[PDB]
């Protein structure tokens, strides 16, 4: 995963929830 | 591994139901109360993840020409590498499984239904074998469920 796609999605999914909690 | 077989059965089922498009009729009997709750949560969040990142997801499944069992062991590694930055959170975690699901669909699509179980094991093996103490500090699957309560 040369471009950190999964990490970055992981962190986005974490961000959206964080802002929902 | 007490609370690993509970992770294994969660990921296998979500992934099998995704591949087969229909929900399984047998009760999830080795995860109990804790593990069935998170499956309900996982179905909810992982389907959104899949739906939200369908293009990103599709882009990656392409690059990883995914066929045999070694491609699966290889993907396992990619996933290990996600957490190298020192950060662990459920977003990551769930995203990893959602991608499992996505890939598993593809696998059944390309007549490799039986690579779906090796895929589930690695994902489980990745997390639990590499992030044992993070997972534990969150009351495990209970933390997952409280994170995504909403």
């Amino acid at each position: 995963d040369e471009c950190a796609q999964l990490r970055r999605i992981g962190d986005k999914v974490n961000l959206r929830q964080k802002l929902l909690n | 591994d007490d609370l690993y077989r509970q992770s294994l059965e969660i990921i296998s089922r979500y992934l099998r139901e995704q591949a087969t498009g229909s929900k399984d009729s047998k009760p999830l009997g080795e995860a109990g109360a804790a593990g069935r709750r998170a499956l309900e949560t996982l179905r909810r969040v992982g389907d959104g993840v899949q739906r939200n990142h369908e293009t990103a997801f599709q882009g990656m499944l392409r690059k990883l020409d995914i066929k045999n069992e070694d491609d699966v062991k290889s993907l396992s590694r990619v996933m290990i590498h996600v957490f190298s930055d020192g950060v662990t959170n459920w977003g990551r975690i769930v995203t990893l499984i959602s991608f499992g699901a996505f890939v598993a669909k593809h696998l059944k699509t390309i007549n490799q239904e039986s690579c779906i179980e090796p895929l589930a094991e690695s994902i489980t093996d990745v997390l639990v074998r590499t992030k044992r103490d993070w997972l534990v500090k969150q009351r495990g699957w209970d933390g997952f469920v409280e994170f995504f309560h909403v």
Side-chain angles (χ1 to χ4, degrees):
Chain A
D1 197 24
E2 274 172 305
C3 306
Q5 273 220 65
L6 278 163
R7 176 190 304 174
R8 287 175 22 83
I9 300 173
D11 293 330
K12 270 161 203 155
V13 165
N14 213 75
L15 192 75
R16 287 198 181 181
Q17 261 292 140
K18 271 209 205 72
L19 279 139
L20 260 17
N21 292 156
Chain B
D1 290 319
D2 203 347
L3 318 92
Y4 149 95
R5 314 182 283 260
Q6 171 201 247
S7 313
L8 182 45
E9 211 185 303
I10 295 184
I11 298 152
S12 308
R13 285 211 41 209
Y14 176 58
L15 267 62
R16 281 178 209 113
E17 288 165 358
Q18 288 281 131
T20 65
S22 63
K23 289 192 177 182
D24 175 26
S25 272
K26 290 154 213 293
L28 186 88
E30 206 200 53
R36 283 209 278 277
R37 267 191 271 265
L39 217 188
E40 315 164 329
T41 288
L42 177 56
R43 279 164 188 167
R44 187 168 51 69
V45 319
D47 286 1
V49 173
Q50 270 174 282
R51 219 162 36 243
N52 290 327
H53 310 103
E54 191 197 27
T55 326
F57 268 22
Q58 189 51 46
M60 287 169 318
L61 153 67
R62 220 187 157 171
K63 274 163 187 68
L64 315 159
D65 171 31
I66 212 109
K67 323 146 274 172
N68 67 36
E69 188 241 5
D70 197 324
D71 300 315
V72 168
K73 283 171 168 165
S74 220
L75 174 60
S76 182
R77 307 198 284 280
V78 172
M79 298 190 296
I80 308 281
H81 187 77
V82 164
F83 298 107
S84 63
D85 68 352
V87 175
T88 321
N89 42 81
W90 297 109
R92 296 198 173 182
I93 278 138
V94 76
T95 294
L96 291 191
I97 300 145
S98 314
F99 191 62
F102 194 82
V103 178
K105 280 144 92 154
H106 168 63
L107 281 163
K108 173 154 183 66
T109 268
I110 73 154
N111 211 226
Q112 298 294 8
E113 191 152 6
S114 60
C115 267
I116 315 185
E117 284 194 331
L119 171 60
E121 270 153 29
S122 76
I123 293 165
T124 311
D125 185 75
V126 161
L127 265 27
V128 175
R129 209 192 58 117
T130 68
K131 286 301 179 156
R132 161 84 45 159
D133 315 72
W134 193 86
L135 275 154
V136 164
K137 282 208 182 208
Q138 326 277 296
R139 307 137 303 163
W141 277 112
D142 299 349
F144 175 72
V145 176
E146 302 156 349
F147 188 68
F148 293 103
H149 180 101
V150 82

